[PDB]
């Protein structure tokens, strides 16, 4: 079965690391950090890796139950939450994943909404379950962020209206802050089992293997609850590529797929890139920053090549 | 090119009418309402209809700029989701992604200013009443309300991220099959994806049902779509020629190898089954639809 990519312009793609549309293609050759994100990870022959799952609604989402209000050494009202798999089944921490699928894969204060729908009805309140939802923040760098152990904590501005023992959903919306004390670093992984334990079962780090190349990212800008900043989240492949690769499960015929970014109106190649077997792009480029390309462009698979293929410069 | 559906269990599907996972398959034959949703509409040969667009992030989303203060109420111009100005003369009911039902939609309004060289930001919980006379997305303007009383900026890029419903009490006018008046009291809805219904006795519509969060109050509200967003995306990609009236599909259990039931997938992009009761389809979590063959509308479905 021949390898293919979907035919989707940048304006028809979404980020695989946060529920955002893709805004621009982006490079940063001077990056000192190891790139090892865990969402948006899929081999070209359709093996999901890391914490990657298929639902756009599952990216940086949690499902579980609040156990009780707790204390912590920062401002706010704090809650402990057991987490399940996103499909509702109990999370088995001994499974060979870094954390429940969908767990955030970066350091930061993730801002969103916690909502609950009660399991029970209370006598005198009627025959329909009660509900509540409130804004919340999850600090993925906190020693209390332990999703691989099956529980996390979140903080609310709301001081009382969160119920213990009731089904709870976290819908991600953006970041709370990117100030100094908020530790936003998109390439720093959480310690999924907390500070005392090594991460396990990680998708591997990615890097170009041919000199002069750099990683090419699909970049989205992420909302902020407040403060100053223009934070972005870079993914290796958009979520639609993860979904397509999973469906097709086409055998990879070499280590590297030559792909061309094409303008369908002219049929002409704008630039070429290497799509590596593990699921990431490299280009030959001598500028950093967003990529200037027409809005109707998309990647087309050309042929399988080897690691020594020399890309034309962008 | 042979017609196909993706191989995805319910736990791998998302709603095309609100950003939610699919929870269950569902029927309700005694529905008195006209079913004419505008999101999640795609023909089998890949033509999007209504307000349907491809992004899961675009469903019930808005992008635009706040004009002024008008709970506390704010007027917002809306653009296309790609940021380009919406042209009301375009042959669509409203900007693609616009909500397609009556209710108080709850979510977060966020802003990032245009002007250490870093812009200011703010975000607040917000509600959009799609039944309001001020809900006029086809005219390029809507209103939203906040609990927040002051910190919403005029003339700055503004995003609405949907989360659920504010309420489903009497005064909240939730009806998933009542369309908004996209141009308000001033003109009737136009260019709509058509209504859907079984045409032959003994059949009813089959829905992909999601339960939608509530900000407060009592209820277990649901949103039913005709096809999940992944099917819309798949059909759009494939654009396989439709060879007859109906794609016959079978819901199969891959573990036992058995067909559980069959359905008609109509060219306009909706399912019917031979059923005359309301409620869930009780099915194993590993089940999924498989395309069998093209048939015409006179094909008689086996009762499910």
């Amino acid at each position: 079965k021949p390898f293919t990519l979907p035919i989707l312009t940048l304006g028809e793609l979404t980020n695989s690391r946060f529920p955002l549309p893709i805004d621009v293609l982006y490079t940063n050759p001077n990056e000192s950090a190891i790139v090892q994100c865990q969402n948006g990870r899929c081999t070209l022959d359709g093996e999901l890796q890391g914490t990657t799952q298929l639902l756009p609604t599952g990216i940086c989402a949690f499902r579980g139950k609040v156990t009780q209000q707790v204390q912590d050494e920062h401002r706010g009202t704090h809650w402990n939450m057991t987490v399940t798999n996103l499909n509702g089944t109990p999370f088995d921490p001994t499974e060979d994943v870094p954390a429940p699928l969908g767990t955030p894969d970066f350091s930061g204060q993730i801002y969103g909404v916690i909502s609950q729908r009660n399991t029970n009805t209370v006598p005198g309140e009627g025959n329909l379950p009660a509900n509540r939802a409130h804004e919340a923040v999850i600090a993925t760098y906190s020693p209390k962020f332990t999703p691989k152990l099956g529980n996390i904590q979140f903080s609310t501005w709301e001081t009382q209206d969160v119920s213990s023992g009731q089904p709870t959903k976290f819908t991600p919306v953006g970041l709370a802050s990117v100030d100094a004390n908020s530790h936003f670093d998109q390439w720093t992984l959480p310690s999924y089992s907390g500070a005392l334990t090594l991460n396990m079962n990680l998708a591997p780090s990615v890097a170009p293997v041919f000199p002069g190349e750099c990683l090419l990212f699909f970049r989205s800008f992420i909302p902020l609850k407040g403060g100053y900043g223009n934070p972005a989240i870079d993914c290796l492949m958009p979520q639609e590529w993860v979904q397509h690769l999973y469906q097709e499960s086409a055998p990879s015929l070499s280590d590297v797929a030559l792909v061309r970014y094409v303008n369908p109106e002219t049929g002409r190649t704008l630039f070429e890139a290497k799509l590596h077997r593990n699921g990431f792009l490299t280009v030959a480029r001598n500028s950093a920053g967003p990529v200037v390309a027409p809005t109707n462009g998309y990647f087309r698979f050309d042929s399988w090549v080897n690691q020594f293929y020399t890309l034309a410069p962008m | 090119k042979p017609f196909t559906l993706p191989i995805l269990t319910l736990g791998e599907l998302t709603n095309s009418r609100f950003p939610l996972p699919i929870d269950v398959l569902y029927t309700n034959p005694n529905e008195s309402a006209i079913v004419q949703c505008q999101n999640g509409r795609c023909t089998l040969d890949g033509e999007l209809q209504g307000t349907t667009q491809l992004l899961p992030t675009g469903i019930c989303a808005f992008r635009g700029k706040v004009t002024q203060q008008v709970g506390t109420h704010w007027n917002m111009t809306v653009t296309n989701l790609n940021g380009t100005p919406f042209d009301p003369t375009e042959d669509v009911p409203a900007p693609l992604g616009t909500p397609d039902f009556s209710g108080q939609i709850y979510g977060v309004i966020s802003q990032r200013n245009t002007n250490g060289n870093l812009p200011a930001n703010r975000a607040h919980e917000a509600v959009i009443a799609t039944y309001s006379p001020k809900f006029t997305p086809k005219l390029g303007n809507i209103q939203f309300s906040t609990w927040e009383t002051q910190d919403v900026s005029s003339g700055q890029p503004t995003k609405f991220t949907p989360v659920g419903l504010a309420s489903v009490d009497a005064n909240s006018h939730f009806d998933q099959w009542t369309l908004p008046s996209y141009s308000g009291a001033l003109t009737l809805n136009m260019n709509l994806a058509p209504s859907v219904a079984p045409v032959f006795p003994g059949e009813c519509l089959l829905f992909f049902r999601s339960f939608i969060p509530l900000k407060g109050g009592y209820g277990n509200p649901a949103i039913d779509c005709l096809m999940p967003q992944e099917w819309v995306q798949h059909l759009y990609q494939e654009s396989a020629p439709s060879l007859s009236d109906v794609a016959l599909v079978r819901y199969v259990n891959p573990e036992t190898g058995r067909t559980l039931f069959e359905a008609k997938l109509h060219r306009n992009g909706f399912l019917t089954v031979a059923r005359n009761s309301a409620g869930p389809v009780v099915a194993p979590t590993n089940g999924y639809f498989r395309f069998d063959s093209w048939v015409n509308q006179f094909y008689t479905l086996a009762p499910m």
Partner: nanobody
Amino acid sequence: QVQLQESLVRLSCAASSMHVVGWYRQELVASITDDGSTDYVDSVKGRFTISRDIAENTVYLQMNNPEDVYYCKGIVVFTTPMHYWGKGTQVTV
């Protein structure tokens, strides 16, 4: 989510424990934090006095000129504030 309530020549604020409570006018007038720290706009300095009272569950603004509606505003999570506003009271001299 909380409900603040205020009060033409003692204004009380009441809710449904906050980190800052401040009085505004239409610009900031006077604020008090849960450290007990206060601050005043330069035009109000010396004449105005903000004061917190835990025992009586409110925050008063004692004002000691014609250039003088006034509002109560109240929570931080990590380092991110959310503000809650009352509906106000007119002031005219």
